[PDB]
Structures are given as structure tokens and as C-alpha cells.
């Protein structure tokens, strides 16, 4: 069980750790988060009390190094940093734990929610979508644009999601215009799965990452990517049975976790109505259709 | 974006553009079967592809054989239209290719956009204009070449005959839309108006009668009257 210590908390801030969140007061003796489950990526996220604009945060994996948070009064944010000295780090953590100045990652034993949201999400894939190769962790915020959003403007601060565009030469084989536009199986199976992602696990990892950035940061480009990757599967007549069954589980947990009050901005009416009621896979997403009909019957 | 009353003069500028109307591509007669069910029988159709500035009409005749063994024909008809318009553009020398294609029906936008991905600089646009191009098959010579076709065929016409020798494109288009609107509202009455005087004929190389400037004013008046007479019925006003 790993630890992300904080040097201090000089500004009042709501701190998120995965699906959990805690309010910290200005100069409250808060020194970090302990008992973080090994085996998953995690995200530690921030919303300042005095400017609720720019949700921002850090994707990390405690297996990849010793990470801590320190407030930078110049750039005005909580920064993740790596401590290269193991013994300094162990001694910092032990002291803060002994003084009980850390919140405990509040996982219920029964509760698979975070695993279910991050099953296919790998740090090495995150670091290719979010390019900052000198760090082992990845910064995301509310305002970062996607490579696709930037085509339609600082390339170094972009989310390099896989570009999906249903009216593109990539999506449509010369001579198969109607077939490929009305049945996206070519685009899903040959171009995206065999060609770019190599397997369904990488495709799902990116889909899950896009959703979590949408939810945790209100990142609009991430929301677009999540819906595009759902629509590409639902709009394909030919999808492996294991991928459909896995997609239904993925979406079920995403819809289960979404704050009820954000359904209006986080869910695209057209995409969900099409996916559940008109698409080739209208009858393949039993769990998802049932939770959407019971939780968000207005949208549908 | 969409072509409307506000940007109407744009049709007659020097940027090559085509209207595409797909309303006569898939045509059927509905009939009873021996068992008393209903079935359709396709008849020959056409794509109506028109340069509004020059009057050049690219009439692609859609022979019933293209529907043989196909499903969802009303959907397929839009994609076949887009395929043939795309083929027409690729067949034209670069300096003759349109800068814009305006579809008369919004359901043509995605099919045509997807077929024209190779031409990213050709704008595909809808229109808010309600254009009466469905009535093209009320022009006897266009109806005759479509119905007689035994195979896919493209036929080239000038839908303005020689009018551009005497009038501007704007005026020619206005005359064409009035004639087609009349033919669409009351075909019998419109054709009566066009041929009632046997001394005015249609040249072998023309679609419409050889009216003098004064005769066109009389005809145009008679077409407006026909359209208002008919409208006073439809709505009881």
C-alpha cells in the first residue's frame, strides 16, 4: 500500500484521489494520502476553493517511483514531483504516518469500482496520450485540447487521443462508401483494432482514460473521444462477442459512477439514443441499457 | 453553409456550381399482387445535375437494372446518386469541376460528402430554396429519353435552350423555376399554356417553345396565374 506525501497545503483546495474527494483548509496540517492500492493507475486531482476553474491533476502508478505533491506559489498549483532518494522518501512518509497527518485511501473491501473503471488503463499508454517524457506521471486539466480539436493550439500541452472521424478517407475505403459509412466494421476491426491499437485491451484502455478525464476534469475533448469510441463499436455490425460483453461492463460502471448532476453535460443524447436504440448493437448492451433507463430516462 | 434567398445572386457568379436533385432517381408504381398484397415496380429514373449559370444539365438516366436484387432502395438511391455525381466530377477536366455542389434534399449531404472525400475543396451545401426540379420529368423530351433507356446513359442538355443569348442567367433560372413550379402544381394546365398556339413550335435541338420576348412575358403571366389559381384551391384562400 503506497503513499503520496504532501510537503504542505498552503491554499484551500478540494483534493480528489480516484473517485473519492476531501476538502483541505488553507494551511491545514495535511501531509498526504496513504494506503493507495498497488496494481492500478491512480489520479490525484485538485480544485482550488478560490478559483474552481481549472480542475487539474496527475495520473500515476506508485510501482513506477516515489511521488509527492508540493505547492508552487509561483505557478499557483499543487505539483507532482518524483523523489529519487528512497531513504529520504521512506523517512518523510514514516514521520507523517506516525503524526497521523495523512488521509487513508478509503476503499471498501467489497468495492471493485476503481478496478472496473481502470481495468484496461496502463500508465505506459497514458504517457503516449499525454507527452511529457521527463516525468513518470501525467498532468491533465479541464482546458487541455485534443490533437483532433487542434486540427479543426500548443502541441506540447495536447491530449494525443487516437483520431476517429467517420467522414475521413481513413474510415472509408474507395468503392465501399455506403458500406463503410453505414457499417463501420472495416474502420473498427482493420484500421483501428488490427492497425493502430493492435488489440481490444488498448482500445478499451483509451476509452476508459477518455471517460475518466471527462468526468474528473470536465475535459470536453476527452468526452468527445469517449463517445466517438463507443459510437465506433455500436455502429459496427461485426464485433467480437467478448468485446461487446466487455464494453457492456465498462459502460455500466462508467454510467454507475457518473455524478447524477453532471449527466446533462457529460452524456451526448444523440450518441446514447443511437447506440442503445438504433445501432447494430442496440440489443448487445443489456447492463448499460438497464442502468441508463433507470438512472437517466430523461436523456433517452 | 445553406443556400437561401439572402445569398441568391451567388448562383450566377463565376464560381462553377451544380445543383443535384435526387427526387426522380428511384421511381416506382405501387400495385396489388394476385394474392391482394401490395408490391412496387421500379421505372427508369434520373439524376438532375444542373449548372444554374450556363443551363448545362447532366441527366444521368438510372435504369431499373441498377435496383435488381438490392435492398433498402430509397437509401441506396441516395448513395447511387452520390456515386454518379462523384463519377461525373472525376470525368470533368479540373478547370470544369464545380467549386460547390448544392443538394436540393438534406438527405443527400452525407452520401455526397463521403463520395467526394477525394475533393476536400469542393463544398457540399444544402439549400433553404424549395426548388421544383422534381417536375423535370414533366419536360416531354427529358421524360422520353429516361423512359426509352435500355441501359445506364448520360445525356447532356441545355435546360435554357438559347435564352442566354437574350437574358441573364438570373432571369433564365427565374423562368425555369416558374415553368417547373407550374408543371409541378398543374401539369395538364401548364402544358396547355406552353403548346396551346400551334404556330410556336419546339426546335428539334430545344426543350421549350421558340417564344419571342413578348410571348415569354405572356407565358410567364399565364404560369403565375396558374400557380395562384391552384393555390386558391389547395388552401381555400
UniProtKB/Swiss-Prot annotation, chain A:
The modification Phosphoserine is found at residue 236. CDD domains: Aar2_C, Aar2_N. One of its GO terms (biological process) is spliceosomal snRNP assembly. It is found in: Cytoplasm; Nucleus. Phosphorylated on serine and tyrosine residues. Residues 244-265 are annotated as: Leucine-zipper. It comes from the Eukaryota. Pfam families: AAR2 (PF05282), AAR2_1st (PF20981). Keywords: Cytoplasm, mRNA processing, mRNA splicing, Nucleus, Phosphoprotein. Its main location: cytoplasm. InterPro entries: AAR2, AAR2_C, AAR2_C_sf, Aar2_N, AAR2_N_sf. The modification Phosphothreonine is found at residue 257. One of its GO terms (cellular component) is U5 snRNP. Belongs to the AAR2 family. Heterodimer. Interacts with PRP8 (via RNase H homology domain and MPN domain), competing with BRR2 for the same binding site. Component of a U5 snRNP complex that contains at least the U5 snRNA, PRP8, SNU114, AAR2, SMB1, SMD1, SMD2, SMD3, SME1, SMX2 and SMX3, but is not a component of the U4/U6-U5 tri-snRNP complex. Present with 7330 molecules/cell in log phase SD medium. Component of the U5 snRNP complex that is required for spliceosome assembly and for pre-mRNA splicing. Involved in splicing pre-mRNA of the A1 cistron and other genes that are important for cell growth. This is A1 cistron-splicing factor AAR2. It comes from Saccharomyces cerevisiae (strain ATCC 204508 / S288c).
Swiss-Prot record, chain B:
It is found in: Nucleus. Residues 7-237 are annotated as: RNase H homology domain. Changing residue 105 to K: Severely impaired growth. Reduced growth at 30 degrees Celsius. Strongly reduced growth at 16 degrees Celsius. Changing residue 22 to A: Reduced growth at 30 degrees Celsius. Strongly reduced growth at 16 degrees Celsius. Strongly reduced growth at 35 degrees Celsius. Component of the U4/U6-U5 tri-snRNP complex composed of the U4, U6 and U5 snRNAs and at least PRP3, PRP4, PRP6, PRP8, PRP18, PRP31, PRP38, SNU13, SNU23, SNU66, SNU114, SPP381, SMB1, SMD1, SMD2, SMD3, SMX2, SMX3, LSM2, LSM3, LSM4, LSM5, LSM6, LSM7, LSM8, BRR2 and DIB1. Functions as a scaffold that mediates the ordered assembly of spliceosomal proteins and snRNAs. Required for association of BRR2 with the spliceosomal U5 snRNP, and the subsequent assembly of the U4/U6-U5 tri-snRNP complex. Functions as a scaffold that positions spliceosomal U2, U5 and U6 snRNAs at splice sites on pre-mRNA substrates, so that splicing can occur. Interacts with both the 5' and the 3' splice site, as well as the branch region. Has a role in branch site-3' splice site selection. Associates with the branch site-3' splice 3'-exon region. Also has a role in cell cycle. Present with 468 molecules/cell in log phase SD medium. The MPN (JAB/Mov34) domain has structural similarity with deubiquitinating enzymes, but lacks the residues that would bind the catalytic metal ion. This is Pre-mRNA-splicing factor 8. It comes from Saccharomyces cerevisiae (strain ATCC 204508 / S288c) (Baker's yeast). The chain holds residues 1836 to 2069 of 2413 of the full protein.
Amino acid at each position: 500500500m503506497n503513499t503520496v506525501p504532501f510537503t504542505s497545503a498552503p491554499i484551500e483546495v478540494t483534493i480528489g484521489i480516484d473517485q473519492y474527494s476531501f476538502n483541505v483548509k488553507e494551511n491545514q496540517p495535511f501531509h498526504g494520502i496513504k494506503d493507495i492500492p498497488i496494481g492500478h493507475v491512480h489520479v490525484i486531482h485538485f480544485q482550488h476553493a478560490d478559483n474552481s476553474s481549472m480542475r487539474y491533476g496527475y495520473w500515476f502508478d506508485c510501482r513506477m517511483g516515489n511521488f509527492y505533491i508540493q505547492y508552487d506559489p509561483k505557478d499557483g498549483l499543487y505539483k507532482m514531483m518524483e523523489e529519487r532518494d528512497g531513504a529520504k522518501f521512506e523517512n518523510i512518509v514514516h514521520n507523517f504516518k506516525e503524526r497521523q497527518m495523512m488521509v487513508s485511501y478509503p476503499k471498501i473491501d467489497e468495492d471493485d469500482t476503481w478496478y472496473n473503471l481502470t481495468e484496461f488503463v496502463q500508465m505506459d499508454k497514458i504517457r503516449k496520450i499525454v507527452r511529457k517524457d521527463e516525468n513518470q506521471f501525467s498532468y491533465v486539466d479541464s482546458s487541455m485540447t485534443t490533437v483532433q480539436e487542434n486540427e479543426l493550439s500548443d502541441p506540447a500541452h495536447s491530449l494525443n487521443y487516437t483520431v476517429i472521424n467517420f467522414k475521413s478517407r481513413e474510415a472509408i475505403r474507395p468503392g465501399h462508401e455506403m458500406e463503410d459509412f453505414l457499417d463501420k466494421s472495416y474502420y473498427l476491426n482493420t484500421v483501428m483494432l488490427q492497425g493502430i491499437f493492435k488489440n481490444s485491451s488498448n482500445y478499451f484502455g483509451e476509452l476508459q482514460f477518455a471517460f475518466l478525464n471527462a468526468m474528473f476534469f470536465g475535459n470536453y475533448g476527452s468526452s468527445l473521444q469517449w463517445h466517438a469510441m463507443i459510437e465506433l463499436i455500436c455502429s459496427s455490425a461485426t464485433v467480437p462477442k467478448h468485446m461487446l460483453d466487455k464494453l457492456d461492463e465498462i459502460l455500466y460502471y462508467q454510467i454507475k459512477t457518473l455524478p447524477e448532476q453532471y449527466s446533462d453535460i457529460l452524456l451526448n443524447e444523440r450518441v446514447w439514443n443511437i447506440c442503445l436504440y438504433s445501432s447494430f448493437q442496440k440489443n448487445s448492451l443489456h447492463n448499460t441499457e438497464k442502468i441508463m433507463e433507470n438512472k437517466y430516462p430523461e436523456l433517452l | 453553409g445553406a443556400m437561401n434567398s439572402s445569398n441568391y445572386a451567388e448562383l450566377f457568379n463565376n464560381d462553377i456550381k451544380l445543383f443535384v436533385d435526387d427526387t426522380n432517381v428511384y421511381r416506382v408504381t405501387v400495385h396489388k399482387t394476385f394474392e391482394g398484397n401490395v408490391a412496387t415496380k421500379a421505372i427508369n429514373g434520373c439524376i438532375f445535375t444542373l449548372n444554374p449559370k450556363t443551363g448545362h444539365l447532366f441527366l444521368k438516366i438510372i435504369h431499373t437494372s441498377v435496383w435488381a436484387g438490392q435492398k433498402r432502395l430509397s437509401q441506396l438511391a441516395k448513395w447511387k446518386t452520390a456515386e454518379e455525381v462523384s463519377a461525373l466530377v472525376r470525368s470533368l477536366p479540373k478547370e470544369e469541376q464545380p467549386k460547390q455542389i448544392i443538394v436540393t434534399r438534406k438527405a443527400m449531404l452525407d452520401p455526397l460528402e463521403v463520395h467526394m472525400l477525394d475533393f476536400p475543396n469542393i463544398a457540399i451545401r444544402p439549400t433553404e430554396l424549395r426548388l421544383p426540379f422534381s417536375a423535370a420529368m414533366s419536360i416531354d423530351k427529358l421524360s422520353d429519353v429516361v423512359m426509352k433507356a435500355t441501359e445506364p446513359q448520360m445525356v447532356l442538355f441545355n435546360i435554357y435552350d438559347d435564352w442566354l443569348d437574350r437574358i441573364s442567367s438570373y432571369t433564365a433560372f427565374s423562368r425555369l423555376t416558374l415553368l417547373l413550379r407550374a408543371l409541378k402544381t398543374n401539369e395538364e394546365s401548364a402544358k396547355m399554356i406552353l403548346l396551346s398556339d400551334p404556330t410556336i413550335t419546339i426546335k428539334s435541338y430545344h426543350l421549350w417553345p421558340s417564344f419571342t420576348d413578348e410571348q415569354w412575358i405572356t407565358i410567364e403571366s399565364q404560369m403565375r396565374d396558374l400557380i395562384l389559381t391552384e393555390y386558391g384551391r389547395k388552401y381555400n384562400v
